[PDB]
Coordinates of C-alpha atoms and ligand atoms in Angstrom, one line a residue:
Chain M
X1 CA 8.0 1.1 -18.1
X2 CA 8.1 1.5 -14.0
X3 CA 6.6 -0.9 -12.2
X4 CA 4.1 -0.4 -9.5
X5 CA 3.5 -2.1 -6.3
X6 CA 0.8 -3.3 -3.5
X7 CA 1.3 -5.3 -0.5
X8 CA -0.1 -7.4 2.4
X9 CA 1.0 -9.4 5.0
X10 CA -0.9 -11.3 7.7
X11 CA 0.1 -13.5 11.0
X12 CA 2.2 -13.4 13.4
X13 CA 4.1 -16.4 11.6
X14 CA 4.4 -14.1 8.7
X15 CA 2.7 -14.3 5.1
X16 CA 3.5 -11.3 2.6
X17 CA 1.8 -11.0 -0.9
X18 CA 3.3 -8.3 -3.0
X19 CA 1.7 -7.3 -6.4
X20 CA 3.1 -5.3 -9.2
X21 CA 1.4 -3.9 -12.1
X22 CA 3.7 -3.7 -15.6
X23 CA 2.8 -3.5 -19.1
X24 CA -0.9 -3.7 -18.2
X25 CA -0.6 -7.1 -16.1
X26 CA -0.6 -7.8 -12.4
X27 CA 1.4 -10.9 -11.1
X28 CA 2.1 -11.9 -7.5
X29 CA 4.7 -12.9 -5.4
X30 CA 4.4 -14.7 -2.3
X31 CA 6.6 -15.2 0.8
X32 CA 4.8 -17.8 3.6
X33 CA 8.3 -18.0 5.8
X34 CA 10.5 -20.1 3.2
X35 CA 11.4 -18.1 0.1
X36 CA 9.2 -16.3 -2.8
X37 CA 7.6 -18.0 -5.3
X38 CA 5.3 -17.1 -7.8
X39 CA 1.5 -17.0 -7.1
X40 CA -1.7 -18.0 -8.8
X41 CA -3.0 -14.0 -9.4
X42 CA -2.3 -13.0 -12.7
X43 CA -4.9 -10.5 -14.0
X44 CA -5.3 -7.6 -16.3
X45 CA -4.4 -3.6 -14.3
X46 CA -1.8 -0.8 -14.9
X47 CA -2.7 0.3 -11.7
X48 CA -3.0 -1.5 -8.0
X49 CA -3.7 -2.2 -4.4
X50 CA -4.5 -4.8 -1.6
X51 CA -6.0 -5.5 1.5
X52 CA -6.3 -8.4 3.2
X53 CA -8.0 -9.9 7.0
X54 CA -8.2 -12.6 8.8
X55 CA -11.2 -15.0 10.0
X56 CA -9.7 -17.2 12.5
X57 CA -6.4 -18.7 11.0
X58 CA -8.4 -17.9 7.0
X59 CA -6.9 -15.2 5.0
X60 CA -9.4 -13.3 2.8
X61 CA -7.6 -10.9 0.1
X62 CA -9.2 -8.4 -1.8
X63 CA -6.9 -6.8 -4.8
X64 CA -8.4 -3.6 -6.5
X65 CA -7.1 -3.7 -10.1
X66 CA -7.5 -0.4 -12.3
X67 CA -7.0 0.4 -16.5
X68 CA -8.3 3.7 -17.7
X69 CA -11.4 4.8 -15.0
X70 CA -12.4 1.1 -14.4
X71 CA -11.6 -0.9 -11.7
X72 CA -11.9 -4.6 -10.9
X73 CA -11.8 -6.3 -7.6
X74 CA -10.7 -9.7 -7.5
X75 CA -11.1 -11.8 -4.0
X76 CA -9.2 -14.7 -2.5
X77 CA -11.3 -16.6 0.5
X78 CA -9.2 -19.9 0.6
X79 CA -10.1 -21.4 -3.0
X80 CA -9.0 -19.3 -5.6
X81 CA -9.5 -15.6 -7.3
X82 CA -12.6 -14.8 -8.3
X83 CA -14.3 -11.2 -9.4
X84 CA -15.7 -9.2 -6.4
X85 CA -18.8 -6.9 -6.1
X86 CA -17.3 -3.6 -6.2
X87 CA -18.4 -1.0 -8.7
X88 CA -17.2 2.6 -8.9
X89 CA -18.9 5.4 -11.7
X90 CA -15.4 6.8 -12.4
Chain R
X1 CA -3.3 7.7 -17.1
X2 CA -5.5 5.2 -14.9
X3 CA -7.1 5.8 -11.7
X4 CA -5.0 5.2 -8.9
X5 CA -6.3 3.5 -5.8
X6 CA -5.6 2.8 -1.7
X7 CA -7.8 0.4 0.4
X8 CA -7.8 -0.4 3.6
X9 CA -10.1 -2.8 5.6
X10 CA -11.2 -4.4 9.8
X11 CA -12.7 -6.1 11.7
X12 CA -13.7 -9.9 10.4
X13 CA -17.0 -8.4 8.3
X14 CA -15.2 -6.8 6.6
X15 CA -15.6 -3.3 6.5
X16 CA -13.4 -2.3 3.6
X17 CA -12.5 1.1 1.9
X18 CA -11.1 2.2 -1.5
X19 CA -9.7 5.6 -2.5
X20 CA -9.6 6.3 -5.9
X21 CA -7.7 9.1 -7.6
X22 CA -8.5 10.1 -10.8
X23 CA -7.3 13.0 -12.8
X24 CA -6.6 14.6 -9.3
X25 CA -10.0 14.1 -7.7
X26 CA -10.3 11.4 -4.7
X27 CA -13.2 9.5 -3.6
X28 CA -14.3 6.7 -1.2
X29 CA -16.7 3.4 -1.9
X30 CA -17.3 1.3 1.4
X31 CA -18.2 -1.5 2.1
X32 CA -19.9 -2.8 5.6
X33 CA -21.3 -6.4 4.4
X34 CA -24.3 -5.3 2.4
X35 CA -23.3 -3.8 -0.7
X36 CA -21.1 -1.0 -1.9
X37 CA -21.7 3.1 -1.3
X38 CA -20.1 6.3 -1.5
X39 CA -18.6 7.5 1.0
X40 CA -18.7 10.9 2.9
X41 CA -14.8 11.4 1.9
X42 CA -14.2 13.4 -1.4
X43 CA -11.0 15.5 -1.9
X44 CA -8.4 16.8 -4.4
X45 CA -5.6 14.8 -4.8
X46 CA -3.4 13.6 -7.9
X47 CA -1.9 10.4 -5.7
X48 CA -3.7 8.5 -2.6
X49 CA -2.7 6.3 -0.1
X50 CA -4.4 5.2 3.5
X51 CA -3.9 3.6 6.8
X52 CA -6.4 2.2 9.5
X53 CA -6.3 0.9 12.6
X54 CA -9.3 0.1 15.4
X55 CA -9.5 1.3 18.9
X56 CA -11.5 -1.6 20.5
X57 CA -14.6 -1.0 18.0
X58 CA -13.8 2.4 16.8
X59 CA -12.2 2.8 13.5
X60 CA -9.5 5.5 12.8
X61 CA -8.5 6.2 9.1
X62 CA -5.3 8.1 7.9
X63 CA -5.3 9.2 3.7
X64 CA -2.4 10.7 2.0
X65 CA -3.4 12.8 -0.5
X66 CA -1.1 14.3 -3.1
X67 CA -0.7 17.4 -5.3
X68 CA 2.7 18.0 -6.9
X69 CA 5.0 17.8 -3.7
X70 CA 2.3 18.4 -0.7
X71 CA 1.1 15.7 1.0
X72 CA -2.1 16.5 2.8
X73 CA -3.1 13.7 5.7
X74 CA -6.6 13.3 6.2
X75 CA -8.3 11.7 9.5
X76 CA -11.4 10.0 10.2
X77 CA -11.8 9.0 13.9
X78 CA -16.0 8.8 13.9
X79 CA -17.1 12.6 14.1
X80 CA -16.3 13.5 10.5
X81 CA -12.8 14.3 8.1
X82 CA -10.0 16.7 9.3
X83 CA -6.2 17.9 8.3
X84 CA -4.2 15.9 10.3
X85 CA -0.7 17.5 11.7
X86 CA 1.7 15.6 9.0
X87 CA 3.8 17.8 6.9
X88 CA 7.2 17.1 5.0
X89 CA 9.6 18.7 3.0
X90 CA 9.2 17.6 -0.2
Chain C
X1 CA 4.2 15.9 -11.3
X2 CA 2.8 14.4 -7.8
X3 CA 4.9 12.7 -5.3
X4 CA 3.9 9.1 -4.4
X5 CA 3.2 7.4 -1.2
X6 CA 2.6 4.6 0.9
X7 CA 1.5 4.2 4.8
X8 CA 1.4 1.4 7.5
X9 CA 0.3 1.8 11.0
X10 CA 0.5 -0.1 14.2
X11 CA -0.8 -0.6 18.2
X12 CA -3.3 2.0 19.2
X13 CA -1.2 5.1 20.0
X14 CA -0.8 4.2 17.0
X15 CA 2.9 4.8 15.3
X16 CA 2.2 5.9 11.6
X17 CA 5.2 5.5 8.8
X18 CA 4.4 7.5 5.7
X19 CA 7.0 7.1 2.7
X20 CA 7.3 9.2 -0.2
X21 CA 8.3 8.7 -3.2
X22 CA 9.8 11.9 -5.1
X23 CA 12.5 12.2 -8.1
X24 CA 13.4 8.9 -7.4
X25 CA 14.2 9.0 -4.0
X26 CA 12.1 7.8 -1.2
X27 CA 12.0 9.2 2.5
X28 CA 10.2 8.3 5.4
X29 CA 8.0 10.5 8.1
X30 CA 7.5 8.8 11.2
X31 CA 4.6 9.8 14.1
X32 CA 4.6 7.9 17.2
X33 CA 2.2 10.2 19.2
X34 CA 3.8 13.3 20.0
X35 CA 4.9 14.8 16.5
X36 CA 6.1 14.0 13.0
X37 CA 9.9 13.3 12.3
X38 CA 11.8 12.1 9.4
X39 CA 12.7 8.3 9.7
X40 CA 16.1 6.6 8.9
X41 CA 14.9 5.0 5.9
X42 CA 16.6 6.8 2.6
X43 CA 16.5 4.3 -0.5
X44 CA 16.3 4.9 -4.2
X45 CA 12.9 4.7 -6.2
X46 CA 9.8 5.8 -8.4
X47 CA 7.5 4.0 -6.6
X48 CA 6.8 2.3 -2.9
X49 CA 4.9 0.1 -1.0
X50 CA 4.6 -1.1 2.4
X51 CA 3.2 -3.3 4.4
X52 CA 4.3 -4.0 8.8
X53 CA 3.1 -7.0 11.1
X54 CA 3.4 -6.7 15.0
X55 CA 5.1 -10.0 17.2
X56 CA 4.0 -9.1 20.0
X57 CA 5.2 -5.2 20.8
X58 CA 8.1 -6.3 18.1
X59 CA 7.2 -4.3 14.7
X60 CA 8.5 -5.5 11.3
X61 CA 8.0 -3.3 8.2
X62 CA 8.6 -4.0 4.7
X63 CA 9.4 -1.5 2.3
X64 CA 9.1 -2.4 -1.4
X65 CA 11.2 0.0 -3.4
X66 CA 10.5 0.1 -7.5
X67 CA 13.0 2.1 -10.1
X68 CA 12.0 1.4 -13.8
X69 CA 11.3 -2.5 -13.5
X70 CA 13.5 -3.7 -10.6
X71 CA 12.1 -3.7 -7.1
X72 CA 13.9 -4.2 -3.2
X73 CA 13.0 -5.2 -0.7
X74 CA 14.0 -3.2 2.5
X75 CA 13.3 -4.4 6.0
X76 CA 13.2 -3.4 9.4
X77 CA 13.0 -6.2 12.0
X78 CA 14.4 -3.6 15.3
X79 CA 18.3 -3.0 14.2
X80 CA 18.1 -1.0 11.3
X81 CA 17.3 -1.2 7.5
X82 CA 17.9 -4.5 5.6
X83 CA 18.2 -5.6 2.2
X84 CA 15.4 -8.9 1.8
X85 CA 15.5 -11.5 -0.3
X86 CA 12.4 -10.4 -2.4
X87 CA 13.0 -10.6 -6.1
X88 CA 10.8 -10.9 -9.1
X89 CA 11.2 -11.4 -13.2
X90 CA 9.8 -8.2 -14.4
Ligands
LIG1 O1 13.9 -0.1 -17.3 S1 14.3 1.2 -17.7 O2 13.7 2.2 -16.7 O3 15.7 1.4 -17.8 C1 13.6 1.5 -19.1 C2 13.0 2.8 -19.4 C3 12.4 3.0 -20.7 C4 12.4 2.0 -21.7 O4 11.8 2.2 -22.9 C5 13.0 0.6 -21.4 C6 13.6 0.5 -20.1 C7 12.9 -0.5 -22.4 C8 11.5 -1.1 -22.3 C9 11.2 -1.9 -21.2 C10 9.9 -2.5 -21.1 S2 9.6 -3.4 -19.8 O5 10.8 -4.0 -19.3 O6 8.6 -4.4 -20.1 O7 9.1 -2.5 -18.8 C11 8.9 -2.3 -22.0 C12 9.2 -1.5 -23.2 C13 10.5 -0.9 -23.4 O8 10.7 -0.1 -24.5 C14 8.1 -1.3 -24.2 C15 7.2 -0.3 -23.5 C16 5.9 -0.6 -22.9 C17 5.1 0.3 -22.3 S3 3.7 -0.1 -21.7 O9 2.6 0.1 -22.6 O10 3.5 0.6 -20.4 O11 3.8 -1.6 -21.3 C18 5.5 1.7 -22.2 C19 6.7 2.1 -22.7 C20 7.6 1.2 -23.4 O12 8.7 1.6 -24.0 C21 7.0 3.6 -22.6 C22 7.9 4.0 -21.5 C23 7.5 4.3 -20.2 C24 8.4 4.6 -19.2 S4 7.9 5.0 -17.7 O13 9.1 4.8 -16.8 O14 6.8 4.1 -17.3 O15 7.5 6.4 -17.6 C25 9.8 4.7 -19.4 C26 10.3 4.4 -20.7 C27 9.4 4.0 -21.8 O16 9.9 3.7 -23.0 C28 11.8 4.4 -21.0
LIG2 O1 14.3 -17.3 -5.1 S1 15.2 -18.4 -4.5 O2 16.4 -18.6 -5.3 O3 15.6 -18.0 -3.1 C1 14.5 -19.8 -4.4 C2 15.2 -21.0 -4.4 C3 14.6 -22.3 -4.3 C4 13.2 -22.4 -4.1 O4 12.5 -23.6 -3.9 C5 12.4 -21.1 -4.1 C6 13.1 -19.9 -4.2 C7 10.9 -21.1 -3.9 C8 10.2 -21.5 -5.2 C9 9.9 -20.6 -6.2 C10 9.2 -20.9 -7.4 S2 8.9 -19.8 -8.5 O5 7.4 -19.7 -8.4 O6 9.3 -20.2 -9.8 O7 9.6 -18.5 -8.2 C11 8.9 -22.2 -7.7 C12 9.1 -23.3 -6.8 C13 9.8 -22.9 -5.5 O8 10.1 -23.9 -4.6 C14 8.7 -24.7 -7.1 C15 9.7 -25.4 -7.9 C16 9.5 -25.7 -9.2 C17 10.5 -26.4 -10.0 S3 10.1 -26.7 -11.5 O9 9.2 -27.9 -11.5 O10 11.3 -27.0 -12.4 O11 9.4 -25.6 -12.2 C18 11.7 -26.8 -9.5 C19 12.0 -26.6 -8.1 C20 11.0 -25.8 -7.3 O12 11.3 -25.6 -6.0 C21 13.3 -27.0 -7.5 C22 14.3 -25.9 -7.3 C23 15.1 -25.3 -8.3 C24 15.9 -24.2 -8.1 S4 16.8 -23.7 -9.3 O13 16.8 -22.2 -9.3 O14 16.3 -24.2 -10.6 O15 18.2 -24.1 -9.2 C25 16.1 -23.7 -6.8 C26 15.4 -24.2 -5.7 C27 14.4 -25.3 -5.9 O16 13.7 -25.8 -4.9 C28 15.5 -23.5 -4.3
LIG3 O1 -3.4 6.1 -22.4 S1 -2.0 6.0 -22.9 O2 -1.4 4.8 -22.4 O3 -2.0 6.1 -24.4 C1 -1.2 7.3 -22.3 C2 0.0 7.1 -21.6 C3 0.7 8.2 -21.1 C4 0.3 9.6 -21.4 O4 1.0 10.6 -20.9 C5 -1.0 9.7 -22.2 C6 -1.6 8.6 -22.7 C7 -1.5 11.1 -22.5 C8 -2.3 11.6 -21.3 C9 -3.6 11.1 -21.1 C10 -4.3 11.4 -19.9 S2 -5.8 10.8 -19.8 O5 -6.6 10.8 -21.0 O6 -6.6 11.5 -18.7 O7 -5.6 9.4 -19.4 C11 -3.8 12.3 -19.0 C12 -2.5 12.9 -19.2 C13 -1.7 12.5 -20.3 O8 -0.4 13.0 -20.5 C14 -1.9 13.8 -18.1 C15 -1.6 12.9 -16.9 C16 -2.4 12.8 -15.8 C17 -2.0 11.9 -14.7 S3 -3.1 11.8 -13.4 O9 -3.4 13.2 -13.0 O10 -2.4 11.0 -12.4 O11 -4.3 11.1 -13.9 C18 -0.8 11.2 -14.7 C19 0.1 11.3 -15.8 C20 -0.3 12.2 -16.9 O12 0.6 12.3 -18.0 C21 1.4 10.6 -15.8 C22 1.2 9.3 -16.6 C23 0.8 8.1 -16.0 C24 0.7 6.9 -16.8 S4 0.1 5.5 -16.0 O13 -0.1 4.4 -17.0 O14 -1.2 5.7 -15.3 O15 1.1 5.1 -15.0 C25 1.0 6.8 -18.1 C26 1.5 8.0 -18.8 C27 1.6 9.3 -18.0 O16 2.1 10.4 -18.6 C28 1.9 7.9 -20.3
LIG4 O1 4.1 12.1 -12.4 S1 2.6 12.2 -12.3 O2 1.9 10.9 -12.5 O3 2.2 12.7 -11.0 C1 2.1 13.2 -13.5 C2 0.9 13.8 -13.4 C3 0.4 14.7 -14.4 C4 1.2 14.9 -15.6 O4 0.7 15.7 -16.6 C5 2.5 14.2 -15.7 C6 2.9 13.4 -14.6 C7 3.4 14.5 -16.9 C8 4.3 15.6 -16.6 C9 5.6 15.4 -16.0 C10 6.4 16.5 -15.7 S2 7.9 16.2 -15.1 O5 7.8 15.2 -14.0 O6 8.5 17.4 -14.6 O7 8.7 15.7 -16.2 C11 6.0 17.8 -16.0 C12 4.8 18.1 -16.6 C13 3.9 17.0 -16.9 O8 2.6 17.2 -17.5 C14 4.5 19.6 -16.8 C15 3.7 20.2 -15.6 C16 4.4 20.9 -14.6 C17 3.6 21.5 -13.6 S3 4.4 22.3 -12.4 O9 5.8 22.3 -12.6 O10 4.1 21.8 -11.1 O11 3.9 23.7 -12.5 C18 2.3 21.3 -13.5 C19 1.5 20.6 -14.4 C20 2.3 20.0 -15.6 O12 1.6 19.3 -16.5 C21 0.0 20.4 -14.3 C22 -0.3 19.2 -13.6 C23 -0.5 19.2 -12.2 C24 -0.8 18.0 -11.5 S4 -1.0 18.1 -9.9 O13 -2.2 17.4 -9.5 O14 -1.2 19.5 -9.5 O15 0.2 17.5 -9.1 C25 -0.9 16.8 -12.1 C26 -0.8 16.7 -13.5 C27 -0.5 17.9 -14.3 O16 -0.2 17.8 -15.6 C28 -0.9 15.3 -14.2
LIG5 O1 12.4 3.7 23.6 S1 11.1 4.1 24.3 O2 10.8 3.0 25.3 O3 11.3 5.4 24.9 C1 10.0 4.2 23.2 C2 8.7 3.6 23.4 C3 7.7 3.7 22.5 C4 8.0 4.4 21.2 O4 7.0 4.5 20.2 C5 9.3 5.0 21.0 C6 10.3 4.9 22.0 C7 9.7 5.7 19.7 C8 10.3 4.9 18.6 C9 11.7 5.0 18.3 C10 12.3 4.3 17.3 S2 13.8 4.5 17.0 O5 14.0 5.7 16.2 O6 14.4 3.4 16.2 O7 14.6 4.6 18.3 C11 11.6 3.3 16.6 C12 10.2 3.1 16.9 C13 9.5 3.9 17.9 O8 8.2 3.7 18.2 C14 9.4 2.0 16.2 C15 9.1 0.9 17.0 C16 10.0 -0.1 17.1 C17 9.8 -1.3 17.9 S3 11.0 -2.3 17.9 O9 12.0 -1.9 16.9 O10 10.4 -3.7 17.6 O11 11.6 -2.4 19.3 C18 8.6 -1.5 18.6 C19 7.6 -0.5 18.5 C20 7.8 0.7 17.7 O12 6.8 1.6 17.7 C21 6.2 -0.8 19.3 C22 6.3 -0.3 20.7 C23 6.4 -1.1 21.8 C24 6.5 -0.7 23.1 S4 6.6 -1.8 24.3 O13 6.9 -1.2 25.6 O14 7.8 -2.7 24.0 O15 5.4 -2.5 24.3 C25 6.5 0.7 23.4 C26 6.4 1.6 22.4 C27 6.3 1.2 21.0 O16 6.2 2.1 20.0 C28 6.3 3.1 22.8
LIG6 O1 25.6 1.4 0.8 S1 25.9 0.8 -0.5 O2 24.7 0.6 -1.3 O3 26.9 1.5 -1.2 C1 26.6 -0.7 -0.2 C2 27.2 -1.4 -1.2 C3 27.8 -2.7 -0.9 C4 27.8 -3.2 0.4 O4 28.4 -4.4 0.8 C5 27.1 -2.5 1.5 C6 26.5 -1.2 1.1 C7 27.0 -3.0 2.9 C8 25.9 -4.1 3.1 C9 24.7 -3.7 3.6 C10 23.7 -4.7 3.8 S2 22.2 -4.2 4.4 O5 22.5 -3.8 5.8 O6 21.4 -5.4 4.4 O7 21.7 -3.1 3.7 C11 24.0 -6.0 3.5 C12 25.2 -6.5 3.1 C13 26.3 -5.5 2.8 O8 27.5 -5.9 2.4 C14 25.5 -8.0 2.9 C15 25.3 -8.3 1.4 C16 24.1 -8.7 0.9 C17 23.9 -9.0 -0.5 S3 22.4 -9.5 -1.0 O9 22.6 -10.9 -1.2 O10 22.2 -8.8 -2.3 O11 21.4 -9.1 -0.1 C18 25.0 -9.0 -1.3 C19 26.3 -8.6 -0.9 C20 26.5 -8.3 0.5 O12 27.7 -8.0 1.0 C21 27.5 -8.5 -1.9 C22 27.3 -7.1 -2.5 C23 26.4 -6.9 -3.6 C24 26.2 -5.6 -4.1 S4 25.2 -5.4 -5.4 O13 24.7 -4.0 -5.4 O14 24.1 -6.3 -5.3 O15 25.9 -5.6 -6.7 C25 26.9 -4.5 -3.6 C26 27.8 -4.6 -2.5 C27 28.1 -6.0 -2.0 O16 29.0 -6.1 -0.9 C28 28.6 -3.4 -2.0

């Protein structure tokens, strides 16, 4: 089945994240200047996408992860993924 | 299918936006740092995607909506949603 | 069927790069202030991302490319398109 993508980036240094949604997973791969490794998200979607801002040097990221009409926002503010607020009547 | 979505987000608040397509219909939920709402923008479209960017504290959005090979760019810069010049040849 | 799309934006004029994904090929539409024009970029895929970071006035825009379960990474850094080192194990 064909992958699909989301991605962020942030700094002037640079710091990429890059998501991809495949058999009803999302996983992450990160680039902070010094080769891609494998991040920490791993959570359930067939379908996503990303922003991200900074506060100061902090990075907050919010992912938006969909299967069937729900969708699940999962947030990053410096110590770890955890669900988000968001709620859509789809 | 799943829903499909775009977000995009500024300032240090956030404010944040999510498109959502589903079964060709797109919608908006927003958030400005109180809780989420529906938002003015709702439009056909099988595929989304968006861009922002601020001028000093004035918020310009771009969405790409999609049916079958059309592309239709819509514009928010503070006095409501308009069709923006893009076209392609697709 | 719908084409797909992605969009990044940059500065305040602002330049807008729109990339479409369509029978497995993905072009690029380009706006810089005065007009839409097709970009240089041309690479094969179902399905695209992008995210672009400013150093300085410098931009740098990454292009992430998906055809069944493989994804590149294309890059512009001011002298044309690039292969990157992005992989993943999908
Ligand atoms: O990678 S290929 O593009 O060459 C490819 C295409 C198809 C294939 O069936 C396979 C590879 C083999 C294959 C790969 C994978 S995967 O590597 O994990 O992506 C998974 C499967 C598979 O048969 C099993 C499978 C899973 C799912 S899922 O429910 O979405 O996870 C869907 C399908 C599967 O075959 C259906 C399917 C979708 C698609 S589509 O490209 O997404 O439209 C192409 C092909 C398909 O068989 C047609
Ligand atoms: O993708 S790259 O080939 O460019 C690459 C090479 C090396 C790298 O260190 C990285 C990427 C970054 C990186 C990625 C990952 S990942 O999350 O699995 O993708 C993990 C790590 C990492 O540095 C951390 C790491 C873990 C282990 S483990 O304890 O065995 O799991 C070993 C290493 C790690 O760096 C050592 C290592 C092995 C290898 S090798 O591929 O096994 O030869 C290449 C590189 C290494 O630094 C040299
Ligand atoms: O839910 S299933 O995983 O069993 C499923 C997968 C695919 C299917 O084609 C169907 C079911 C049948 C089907 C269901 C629906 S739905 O009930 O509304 O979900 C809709 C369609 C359909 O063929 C028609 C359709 C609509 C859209 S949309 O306008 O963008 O929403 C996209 C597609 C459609 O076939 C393409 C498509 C996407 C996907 S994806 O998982 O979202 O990428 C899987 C399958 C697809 O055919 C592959
Ligand atoms: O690829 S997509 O995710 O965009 C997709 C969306 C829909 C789908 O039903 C399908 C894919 C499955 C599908 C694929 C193809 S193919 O790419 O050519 O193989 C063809 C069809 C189909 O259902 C048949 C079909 C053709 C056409 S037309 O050639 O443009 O007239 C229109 C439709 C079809 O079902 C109706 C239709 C329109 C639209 S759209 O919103 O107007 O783009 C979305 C989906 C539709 O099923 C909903
Ligand atoms: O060459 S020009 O000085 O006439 C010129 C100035 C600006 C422009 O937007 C363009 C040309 C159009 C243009 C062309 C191309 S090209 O097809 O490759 O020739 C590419 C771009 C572009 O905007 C994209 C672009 C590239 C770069 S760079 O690759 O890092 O040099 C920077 C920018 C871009 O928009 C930002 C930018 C900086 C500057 S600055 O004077 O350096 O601050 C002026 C203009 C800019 O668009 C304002
Ligand atoms: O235009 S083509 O797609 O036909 C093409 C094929 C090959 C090519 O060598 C090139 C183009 C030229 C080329 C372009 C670039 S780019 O400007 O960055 O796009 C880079 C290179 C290059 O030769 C350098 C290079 C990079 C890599 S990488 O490590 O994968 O990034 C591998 C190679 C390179 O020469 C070896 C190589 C691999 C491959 S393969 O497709 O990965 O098997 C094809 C070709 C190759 O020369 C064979």
């Amino acid at each position: 089945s064909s992958v699909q993508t989301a991605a962020t980036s942030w700094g002037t240094v640079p710091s990429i994240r890059v998501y991809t949604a495949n058999n009803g997973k999302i996983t992450e791969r990160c680039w902070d200047g010094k080769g891609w490794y494998t991040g920490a998200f791993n959570e359930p979607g067939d379908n996503v996408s990303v922003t991200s801002w900074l506060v100061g040097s902090a990075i907050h990221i919010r992912v938006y992860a969909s299967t069937g009409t729900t969708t699940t926002e999962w947030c990053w503010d410096g110590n770890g993924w955890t669900k988000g607020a968001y709620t859509a009547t789809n």
